[PDB]
Amino acid sequence: TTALVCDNGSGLVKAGFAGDDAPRAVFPSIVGRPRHQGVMVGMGQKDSYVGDEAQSKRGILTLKYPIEHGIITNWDDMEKIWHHTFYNELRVAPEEHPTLLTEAPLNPKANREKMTQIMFETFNVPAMYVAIQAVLSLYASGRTTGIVLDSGDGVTHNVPIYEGYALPHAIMRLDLAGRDLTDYLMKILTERGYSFVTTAEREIVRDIKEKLCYVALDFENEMATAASSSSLEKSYELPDGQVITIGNERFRCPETLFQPSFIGMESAGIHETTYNSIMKCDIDIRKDLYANNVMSGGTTMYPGIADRMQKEITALAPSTMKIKIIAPPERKYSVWIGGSILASLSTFQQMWITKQEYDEAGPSIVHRKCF
Amino acid sequence: TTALVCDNGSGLVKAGFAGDDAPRAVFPSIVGRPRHQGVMVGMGQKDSYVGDEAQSKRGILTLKYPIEHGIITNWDDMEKIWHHTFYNELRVAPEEHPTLLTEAPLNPKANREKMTQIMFETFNVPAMYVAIQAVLSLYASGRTTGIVLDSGDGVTHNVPIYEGYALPHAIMRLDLAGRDLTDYLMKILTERGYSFVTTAEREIVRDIKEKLCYVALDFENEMATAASSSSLEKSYELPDGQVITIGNERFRCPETLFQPSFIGMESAGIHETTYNSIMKCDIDIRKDLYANNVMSGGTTMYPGIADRMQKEITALAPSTMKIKIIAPPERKYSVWIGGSILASLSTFQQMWITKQEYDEAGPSIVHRKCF
Amino acid sequence: TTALVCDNGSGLVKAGFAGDDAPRAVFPSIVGRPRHQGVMVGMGQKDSYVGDEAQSKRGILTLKYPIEHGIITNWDDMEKIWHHTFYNELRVAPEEHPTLLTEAPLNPKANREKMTQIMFETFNVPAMYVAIQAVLSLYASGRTTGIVLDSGDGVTHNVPIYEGYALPHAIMRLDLAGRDLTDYLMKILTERGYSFVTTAEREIVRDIKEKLCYVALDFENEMATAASSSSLEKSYELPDGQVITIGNERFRCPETLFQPSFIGMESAGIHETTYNSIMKCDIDIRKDLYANNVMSGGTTMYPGIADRMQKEITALAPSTMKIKIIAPPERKYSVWIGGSILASLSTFQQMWITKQEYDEAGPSIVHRKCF
Amino acid sequence: TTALVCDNGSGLVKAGFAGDDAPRAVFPSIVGRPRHQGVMVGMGQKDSYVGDEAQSKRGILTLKYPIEHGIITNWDDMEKIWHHTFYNELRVAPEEHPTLLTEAPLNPKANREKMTQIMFETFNVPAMYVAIQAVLSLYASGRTTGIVLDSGDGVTHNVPIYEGYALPHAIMRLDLAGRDLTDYLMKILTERGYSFVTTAEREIVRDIKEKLCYVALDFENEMATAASSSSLEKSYELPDGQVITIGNERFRCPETLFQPSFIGMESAGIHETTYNSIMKCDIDIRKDLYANNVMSGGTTMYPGIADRMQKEITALAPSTMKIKIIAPPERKYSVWIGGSILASLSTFQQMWITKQEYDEAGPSIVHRKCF
Amino acid sequence: TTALVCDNGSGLVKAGFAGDDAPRAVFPSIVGRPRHQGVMVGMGQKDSYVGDEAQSKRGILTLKYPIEHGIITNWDDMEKIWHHTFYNELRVAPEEHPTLLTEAPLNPKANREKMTQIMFETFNVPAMYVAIQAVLSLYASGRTTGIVLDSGDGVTHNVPIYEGYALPHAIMRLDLAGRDLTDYLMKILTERGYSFVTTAEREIVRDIKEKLCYVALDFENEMATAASSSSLEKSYELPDGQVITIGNERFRCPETLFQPSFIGMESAGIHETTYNSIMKCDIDIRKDLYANNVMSGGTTMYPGIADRMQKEITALAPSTMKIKIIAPPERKYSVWIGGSILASLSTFQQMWITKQEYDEAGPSIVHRKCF
Ligand SMILES: C/C1=C\CC[C@H](C)OC(=O)C[C@H](c2ccc(O)cc2)NC(=O)[C@@H](Cc2c[nH]c3ccccc23)N(C)C(=O)[C@H](CCCCN)NC(=O)[C@@H](C)C1
Ligand SMILES: Nc1ncnc2c1ncn2[C@@H]1O[C@H](COP(=O)(O)OP(=O)(O)O)[C@@H](O)[C@H]1O
Ligand SMILES: Nc1ncnc2c1ncn2[C@@H]1O[C@H](COP(=O)(O)OP(=O)(O)O)[C@@H](O)[C@H]1O
Ligand SMILES: Nc1ncnc2c1ncn2[C@@H]1O[C@H](COP(=O)(O)OP(=O)(O)O)[C@@H](O)[C@H]1O
Ligand SMILES: Nc1ncnc2c1ncn2[C@@H]1O[C@H](COP(=O)(O)OP(=O)(O)O)[C@@H](O)[C@H]1O
Ligand SMILES: Nc1ncnc2c1ncn2[C@@H]1O[C@H](COP(=O)(O)OP(=O)(O)O)[C@@H](O)[C@H]1O
Ligand SMILES: [Mg+2]
Ligand SMILES: [Mg+2]
Ligand SMILES: [Mg+2]
Ligand SMILES: [Mg+2]
Ligand SMILES: [Mg+2]
């Protein structure tokens, strides 16, 4: 019965089977609650919508994510989703086969531990394993050496691996991610009278940025040219047919990844976060890391993110260092892909945590890391 | 013994049984009082006529409605009618079975509360329920999503429902209704020497408008073409054989629904009342509301009301929004039909307020709303 | 050559010049036709008497009013009168100067239109204007805010004006007027054997009521005290010296204005007609209207009409509202006075409809209303 | 000639001179248009009333605000007002001296830009400056550190300032404001049969809430005690002397500020809006912000708003944090007061935008922000 | 006018006068820059805060150290501090008297040279001298023989002195110091959801470790006992009242000094660094060094650092060697104390480098070392 791979991340959940080349089910990790009145209850109707069903009824629901900044903040809702994923969407009964879950590095221990508990107690998972998202992304590329820049709506992080050996001590992690980009866009659009405020509207704004936003190659020049009407300006058609003129914001929003101060984020831009994480490692390694900068995660789907990353990291490094950014198609699936690969590996099977094994050992087992 | 459905609205009362496809008894909610002399009393004769009996003797009675603008202004008379409805007209003894009553949203609480009191104290109703007229209208259509424009002689109102979930916060209500249309017609006909002034005459005028009036598709053009004698002009034959030439008024009266200022009504025309009520709701919903504009209530029987509504709402909305007005046959029965349907529902039975239940709880129970 | 002001109302015609403080000619709008035999024709003699000449020969003429309920019912006769007014009585040739005519609001359009036609075609009027009687009455008072209760033998009506701005939408009009009072008096006097039946006799009865009738302050008490012989009873001396004892009728006739049902008039008494017309207007206005109740028109010459009006309107209104009825001397001339004033205004001259202007434009021009 | 300070906000305009301790002229930013008929035009009379003159004639005008939600929606009308303010009401000729204008943060750029344009092109303003309302409010208090909760009928917003340094990144803004409170009150009063619907009536309702409404300290308990007749109930005397019994609504209306869902406002109550805005800022700052919660703006004149705010914010914060709400007298003038102070500052003079300076630079200059 | 002693180290600057028993001024060598917005400039306000003033305004500043790992990385900022130290904080004018500066051994020559330059060119220092921190520490103890383990937030180093004669050839130096401990603590606290990321927050974390951290005597046993809730766990109260539960980390952070690999530091723990530095020296000396292990510097304020150091160094050495660690009170002032002593010595005066002397000789003079 093989095994199930579930990219239970923030934003979207991507699930499919070990051995598949792509997730079979992709949908938002969103729980929607009937906003007006109470619910109905007596006439059924529903007091809870999940993912794409929440999207169908979006406008009458208060939308909540259970995961924020890579952390399961609302366990009740997350549990509800998990059920709705493989149990309802994939037509899978827990006990049929074991499953792979993921998380971003440097989470609170409790995040992983409680997640595990649920898999074994709420569900009948017959063996489970948790892996670092960035690591999986590298597996998807097939490389054994490089920097993984994994950036979603939850978190942005850098993992450094060299010839199969990870370097724990230099892993970087930022709260700065897609939701901050989204929130910033909601804010910045008030400059032109386009006030989005509800959770439902927030999702529209996300739709906008995923279609129109791009990374300024040279922000200064883009701002200069933005003083003149041009191809910069786009007309976004809303759900109710009214249209929005997007100007400078089309690139100013992505800009925040390189100038975090825009949103109050007292930090370094991702080009420096990356640079510095490389600087933290031995000089004997750095040369290779430079030429294997694997970029993945949905925020890296912005057009030009690779081009400008290349530009700025090149500027920071010595001119004699050759830098190469890897940015394949399907970056949005990279982690999941890695998972499919991982689970299909013969050797890997020894890493499974059997429910019984867990029951015998207890919580702490989920942090073991041999490979 | 099933249950009784009673559309106890202003204007007309339409009663029949739960499970019927149409009301069995339809008649005016009018109380007539012998105008000349006193009454008779000693020789019987009668000091009160109701509905169709008042119509028979119309010309010697002062006619009063007990309900005005959806509010039971004269309880004595309304009580008298209720008796005369099911007790006399339908041949029903209260206690045989429970009954469904209706009202327009945003009434004074006392309207519902006192009505309830009477059902349980004056009559022996063994369980009673009150429903919003617009909601019922939507049930009659069978849709779960849309705008209900319910307009009678009492009030005009807009209710927005989405996929089974009502949106309380955006319900609109106007005093502007059929009696204002009627009163205006009485007034406007003095332009041609046709002065109607009594309550009895008022009813004639109502008869006129229900036969000849129509909604101008393009009011301006109709006024222009009205400068020439044509098919516009009609000869109405009065009760005593004298005839009336109706001109421009044939459409100028319905015009007031779109230009309320004609009667001093500082408001927005119903095309804007509708438009705005949609604007009040989330952009994620508006698209669907546009395509499910359910129009019902007797004033919507004017020929062309749908055509022009379509025209003007289309003009207000974006050209990319598809708008569809639903305007079935039997719009005049829609609310009652919905009631028959509602009462026939198995689930619905839990909503009944048992007389005992009321007696135990008290007044406030009539505003509970779970479903 | 200034201009001519003509209060061409029902009952009496009052004409004088713009700038005069009172009409120069006042006489009945009555056409009398030799009742017995034919006429004479061959020996001249006359087949038509008008106004005061008809009064001279009253007893051998059938008297007809051309205007009834404010409407020119008999154009032939009205035309004849108009000639006899300014042409014969005032010694004026049409073309010397323009003229102001009046009418009660809510007349049939044709009333005004045909009147206009005659002024320009039968006569040589070099510019003409028609004004609402009530409006003019307010001008005579000099106020810019108030209720005008204008009541003659033709009609009774209420006009509401606020700070120079009329409120069309709340104008009230009743058929109930002086001729109904007169007719009722003719009828009620048969109780004591004083049967008046001819048109000539009708005029006597009018003379009676204009001398003896008064408004009961408290009708109930007056009826009670009327059971005892007192100052109530008066001896009216007829044209032939016989005398009439008037009792209760002396106030019971005016009573009908407050209890219209007495004459079959299914309506509200004038105290409620007034009250309600105020209720029809915005709460922000009503307070002022209460304190500016301008009463005018000949029927308001009954002693006590103001006192009782005050009483009953006060009762209807809230005790905190201050009510003041204006009832100057010369109420019988108020409309005409207003006309004199109006015509003397510099600004007003732009309102004249030049004969040529009319000829060019046509009928419809008489309903323009800019000021 | 000093300078002019003009709190050109929504609702009311408060103008006075730099150095004054209070505005000299305070009046509604309302434009009224003769509702019935047309206007008059030819006889003058007026086709436009502003502020207190519109209040005088309130009942015959359609009242419009030009500013809605802090945005000048109707420039024609706003221009008209500006003229009527200092030009007519204060007896000031533009060019005599420079002026200070204000606006709520996060407005559309065009709001400020167009406003500027008018000051320099329509008027002869010799130097102008625009400031954030909340900032000015803090200046009025004299503090350099704190939270400014500025809430009017337009918008509600939170600004955080620390030791003279603003924190742009954590400014909050809500549409939820006084007009929503007012509109809600209009609606909620239909429960007791007090239907207010016109723009004129809306102003009455505002008058009601400004006199009777208060903030429930414990809403639940107030609702419980509201089941019994008590001091809760008040008799409001309307403009026409009729009285209104206000019950639960007297506090249920203010309740919406803490439970926005009441009006469909999918948001957080102002106690959480405030709390969260503090949470958005560094832990090293939060302690001070807690003890300097400066509340201002006219909606904060509701009795008990401070008491309950204190209660709920205290509950949300840790028990060890000391919280202090500043709520001086003259909260309604706070912004203007700050303006007077600001303009009187020597240093501040460098911030003026000279008309010439603007003409040379152009639009963008109005968003400069050095201090 | 005596002389000034300035422990211009990383972390804190401790200044006082030659002859004093303790520094008069102690404050952080931190420069803070207004993080949000720009600054203010025009209204003054300040664009730079130093030490305790930066602490006052901590939360709105980006905090930077100018010294890192014992090296003045940012000269601009360090210069600024020096001014703010004696010039502003101590109320001293440079030229009043000569001054003693310090540094950690094995710095880049330029560190000392540039520092000197500034003292003579930026300031008017009339003679200056630079001494090795460890040497001074030994002077403070009063011993002439021993190992000085001087460990601050900048660097950790070992100096060996025997009977007044230093042994240059065996001086050890590590980057591993207090900031690594601090940074590690920031990281390790994410295990329990306590994410500190800003420079301001970093300072809080430092405050935490300086209050709660201690050195595990037996790390293994502490980890074992840490599996059970006990006295290990502490509740730290943050600046905003929220509390933090510190567990294992309370000793795991100090552990890194003995197992540097925890932070990627491929080195030997300080117990072996010390041991080995002794091994590097002649067997005829080692015996004495063992009995005079002078520990100083702020990181040695962790409770138990002496106890465990004793334990582990004893284990490494032969059982017959007597080992004694000196760990007086005021270890945090040791270097400065030594400086006060040094400057007060008569003989020592010959070591001063006169400004003129420097000007004549040039840069190289600062590395002379006779005594
Ligand atoms: C409508 C929408 C996007 C499309 C806007 C429309 C199609 O285009 C415009 O009309 C531009 C037009 C505009 C153009 C030019 C100009 O100088 C001043 C204003 N924007 C406004 O007026 C603002 C008015 C407004 C109210 N608070 C605000 C807060 C900030 C900014 C604006 C507003 N405005 C459209 C909205 O607020 C509305 C209502 C706000 C939602 C919650 N209440 N917005 C929305 O509901 C969502 C769907 C976003
Ligand atoms: N076309 C796109 N352009 C930019 N960002 C995108 C695009 N599609 C998705 N994203 C962003 O990627 C994130 C969602 O996908 P993903 O990053 O895979 O989520 P997660 O990594 O949390 O599973 C969001 O930030 C989303 O907006
Ligand atoms: N043929 C018609 N054309 C227009 N209006 C009609 C017609 N028949 C009935 N009406 C109007 O509908 C109202 C009466 O029916 P209805 O609206 O159902 O009353 P209610 O809704 O109050 O029960 C009146 O306004 C009536 O004039
Ligand atoms: N003394 C009076 N008392 C009561 N009514 C009078 C008196 N004089 C005239 N009227 C009434 O006024 C009307 C005639 O004058 P008027 O009202 O001015 O006529 P009109 O208004 O039609 O020009 C008649 O109803 C007449 O009886
Ligand atoms: N006594 C009061 N109680 C409550 N609210 C008030 C009171 N007086 C004024 N307000 C409200 O304050 C707003 C008007 O004053 P203000 O808030 O200063 O307007 P703005 O801030 O837009 O200038 C309105 O919401 C008004 O109802
Ligand atoms: N109570 C304490 N416990 C542990 N370390 C401390 C304590 N107080 C200060 N320190 C550490 O000492 C260093 C600061 O003082 P110090 O070591 O004298 O600085 P420096 O030596 O650079 O002048 C920092 O590492 C600081 O955290
Ligand atoms: Mg991801
Ligand atoms: Mg109906
Ligand atoms: Mg008259
Ligand atoms: Mg304000
Ligand atoms: Mg040190």
Swiss-Prot record, chains A, B, C, D, E:
Oxidation of Met-40 and Met-43 by MICALs (MICAL1, MICAL2 or MICAL3) to form methionine sulfoxide promotes actin filament depolymerization. MICAL1 and MICAL2 produce the (R)-S-oxide form. The (R)-S-oxide form is reverted by MSRB1 and MSRB2, which promotes actin repolymerization. Can be mono-ADP-ribosylated on Arg-173 by SpvB of Salmonella spp. This modification blocks subsequent polymerization and leads to cell death. One of its GO terms (cellular component) is cytoplasm. The modification Methionine (R)-sulfoxide is found at residues 40, 43. The modification Tele-methylhistidine is found at residue 69. GO terms for biological process: actin filament bundle assembly; actin filament polymerization; mesenchyme migration; positive regulation of gene expression; skeletal muscle fiber development; skeletal muscle thin filament assembly. Its EC number is 3.6.4.-. The modification N6-malonyllysine is found at residue 57. InterPro entries: Actin, Actin/actin-like_CS, Actin_CS, ATPase_NBD. Keywords: Acetylation, ADP-ribosylation, ATP-binding, Cytoplasm, Cytoskeleton, Hydrolase, Methylation, Muscle protein, Nucleotide-binding, Oxidation. SUPFAM superfamilies: Actin-like ATPase domain (SSF53067). It comes from the Eukaryota. The keyword Ligase does not apply. GO terms for molecular function: actin monomer binding; ATP binding; calcium ion binding; calcium-dependent protein binding; cytoskeletal motor activator activity; hydrolase activity; identical protein binding; magnesium ion binding. Belongs to the actin family. In vertebrates 3 main groups of actin isoforms, alpha, beta and gamma have been identified. The alpha actins are found in muscle tissues and are a major constituent of the contractile apparatus. The beta and gamma actins coexist in most cell types as components of the cytoskeleton and as mediators of internal cell motility. This is Actin, alpha skeletal muscle. It comes from Oryctolagus cuniculus (Rabbit).
